[PDB]
Amino acid sequence: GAMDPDVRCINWFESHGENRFLYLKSRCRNGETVFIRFPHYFYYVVTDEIYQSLSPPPFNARPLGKMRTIDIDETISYNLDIKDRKCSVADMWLIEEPKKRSIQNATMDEFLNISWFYISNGISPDGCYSLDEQYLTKINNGCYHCDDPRNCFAKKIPRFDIPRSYLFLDIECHFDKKFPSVFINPISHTSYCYIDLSGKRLLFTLINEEMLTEQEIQEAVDRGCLRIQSLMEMDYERELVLCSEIVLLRIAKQLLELTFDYVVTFNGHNFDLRYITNRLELLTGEKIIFRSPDKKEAVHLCIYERNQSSANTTFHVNNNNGTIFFDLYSFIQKSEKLDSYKLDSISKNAFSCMGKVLNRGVREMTFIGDDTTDAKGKAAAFAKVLTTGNYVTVDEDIICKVIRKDIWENGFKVVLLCPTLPNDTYKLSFGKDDVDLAQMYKDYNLNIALDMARYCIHDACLCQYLWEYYGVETKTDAGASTYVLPQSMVFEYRASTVIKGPLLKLLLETKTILVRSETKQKFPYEGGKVFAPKQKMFSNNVLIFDYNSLYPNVCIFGNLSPETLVGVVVSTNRLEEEINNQLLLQKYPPPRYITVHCEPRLPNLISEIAIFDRSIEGTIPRLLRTFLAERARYKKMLKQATSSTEKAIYDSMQYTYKIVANSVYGLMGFRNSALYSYASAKSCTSIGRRMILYLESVLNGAELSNGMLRFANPLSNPFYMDDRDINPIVKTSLPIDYRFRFRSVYGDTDSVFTEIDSQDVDKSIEIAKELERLINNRVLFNNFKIEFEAVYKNLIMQSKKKYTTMKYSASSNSKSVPERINKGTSETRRDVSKFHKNMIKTYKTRLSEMLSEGRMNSNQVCIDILRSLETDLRSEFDSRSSPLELFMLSRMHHSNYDNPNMYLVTEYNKNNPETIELGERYYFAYICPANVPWTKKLVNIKTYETIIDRSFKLGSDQRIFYEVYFKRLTSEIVNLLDNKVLCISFFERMFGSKPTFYE
């Protein structure tokens, strides 16, 4: 009977016909669903003079107030004769039009119609409301129309929780050597995970019969599978169903046409759904059809693309029914920087626990995880993935099938098919998987079909596990709130599109319009500025300080905005440069104006100086000021809340305000952006770079003696003359006995690393906290702050991307467990041999001790540790006392896409009593004839790969091919070294080749 008028908006979407509409999908507190339809207008902003002139009048119009319109075109000047920036005031109108309309000098055209809908009717995209039924007329069951949303939506109310329905899916298509093509390859599986409004999970997988034997099909039935002959016969409470391809496909079409809230895949948009759809057209005639909630519009499922250069392409579904088709692969690429975007890597990082041993021996380890084993609920998360996980990875490398599992709400007990090395504790991960589909299809039979079923369901369920892990539901809503956009458009549109809502709201609040009256000349700002450590290896501890949101703070500090730019003064010679600099300082003094040297924009210019007026807060800085404030609010809300559902919501909001603030720098330099401003962007970079150098100049060589911190240079404000005490000698609250010395060791865009001559992590943290305080009170000024993050012990670092250290955090003390930090690496467990590991471990421990002596050039360390390598190496090549064991390496056998490895294992199987089986882990070594001498050439070191089985004995007329191991080893050693020229001379002489340095 009666509609619940209490609704929570969950998506918004549009139909596109000649007769088009905007639709809302909302969820009521009971659980019912209400679609509401609204007429589509196109919005235009005009000046009052244009308004009065209009051919026929607009359908509707609301006044906007007086608004300043400002010319933000950027001009350079070769002297100080800088014309004032053009500026007019006028009453403005927001006009509505049911047809598209060309209005000769309409303004604010960059902003989106949908944004105007929300702003103009006072509707928040994710709001809860008590609808005013007076303004709704029903039209289907469940679908109402609303001519007056401003009044209908007038009673906003607080957020109530709602249930939501999900379908997560994955498919498996047959193939042998080429990538599966819809014209030739059938779908072999379709797996589905349905989460109901109740929270109940339903799992079901359809298996393609036509790829099995009539006997096999009957075995499946006997074994407990259901077999069905048509769509009508499907029973969704059956986890395993066999049917024909056409049935399977008709079943997908039925599911995909349903109005789930979310349909969720990993690369489903470009692969899985494309394949289902095309394969369905092929085998029957049929389309997958979506309909608007009032049945007025019907579209056939058609995947479309969106492009965005700096770059990758994303794929999207064109459903007009309110369902959010969400591809985690696109999303994870937009929201994270990672080395791999393969599902196995993404799973490895996201889902891991610490596993305490319960049994050893046979070919079966066993572990337990719980609150007592890692951290509160880390095992609960792991247990939830295990419900369908088939392969756990142990200790980073040992992939091993599950055998049994016990699961409860907080822990798991799992038994696995691995080797043995039983330390009391080990790390468990759901990552890589030693499965060769191409082989599986080649030998396909019932048991393999069931194995794939188990794999396919797990990939579908990984989509729900990842969806919980990345918090996509709340990120979507936070996105919608903040960007003033439909939930479904939040992770579809790009960074330049999403900034526009909040920007528009600000332009309205500040009664300001920004107009570029010219074609933008071409230049971005980037000059690829990359940062290299003063040295790689650290004997002493290293202090880590982060600037707090440097670039947003730079823009605020300088009042950097396209309209606060007074002008840009350039010079081609030193006389003009000097004259201009002295006129600058008279005409645009501080502190009202800041003047910023930038990298000049033309090759003939020796100087370029952007001048900003800080008297009236500019658009961009105020935007950022809002974003930072809102983030702070939410971080506090996140700690004042206690319900974990609320924590998730406030964490997402907080995150969204981080992301959007961080988008602003790039957007200032991107020419298709509403925030583009060459000078502002360049100036932001320049001011930031200067803050880094200032902080570094001050700490580099700074010392702490008595209770005084002697900074290495005065505390002078680098941009202009200042109120503050520049005295670099500064009272500290540290112990008088402390005597320490500091070195600026690395620094980048937003971070600064300070070596301290001490290994005492307890004291290193005590001092750093005090450095933090003095840096913020005396060194820095206005809104520039750092924060002490952590101490890094045994830092070895190569870049910001590739580094290794033990990290004792700010919270930390001397004796808590560090955090092993690895980054950018590729090795361990049989990429590299025990001879290499044992040598690297030795050559490090000796090098760290050479740095604690203090008695070094670059070259007195370097000569000494390279002499020592020639000695140890020539010794091993002559004395040859090291077991063959020490040079063995591993690998997994599998089929192709690898190629000369198949020839390697084949020939071993073809010539030897044993067979290395197709999912087996086999040892190898670099072996050559003993009559080969020291070799400075090289070749296909693949020829010398020799499978070492259990029988194998080294020929009397064979040797370990030491060179291969040595070259790889001196490589790792010369990248520990700072003297580069010495290292290359060694490597050419010893190996006839030129070494790689990780640049």
Residue numbers in the entry: -3 to 306, 314 to 900, 904 to 1005
Source paper text:
Here we present the 2.7 Å crystal structure of the full-length VACV DNA polymerase and the characterization of the interface between E9 and its processivity factor subunit A20. E9 crystallized in space group P3121 with one molecule in the asymmetric unit. The structure was solved at 2.7 Å resolution using the MIRAS method. We observed the classical palm, thumb, finger, exonuclease, and N-terminal domains of a family B polymerase in an open conformation. Only 10 out of the 1006 residues could not be modeled. Three poxvirus-specific inserts are clustered on one side of the molecule, corresponding to insert 0 (aa 67–82), insert 3 (aa 572–610), and insert 4 (aa 708–743), whereas insert 1 (aa 208–233) is located on the opposite side. Insert 2 (aa 356–432) is located on the back of E9 in the exonuclease domain and forms a little 6-stranded β-barrel with a greek key fold. The helix of insert 3 forms an important contact as it is bound in a hydrophobic cavity of a symmetry-related molecule mainly comprising residues of the exonuclease domain (i.e., residues 190–200 and 227–233). The temperature factors indicate a high mobility of insert 2 (which appears to be in loose contact with the body of the polymerase) and of the thumb domain. Still, for E9 electron density is visible for all the C-terminal residues.
Poxviruses (members of the Poxviridae family) are large double-stranded DNA viruses that replicate exclusively in the cytoplasm of the infected cell. The enzyme is a member of the DNA polymerase family B15 possessing DNA polymerase and 3′−5′ proofreading exonuclease activities. E9 alone was shown to be distributive under physiological conditions (adding fewer than 10 nucleotides per binding event) unless bound to its heterodimeric cofactor D4/A2012. A20 links both enzymes, and the DNA-binding properties of D4 are believed to increase the association of E9 with the genome template thus rendering the polymerase processive.
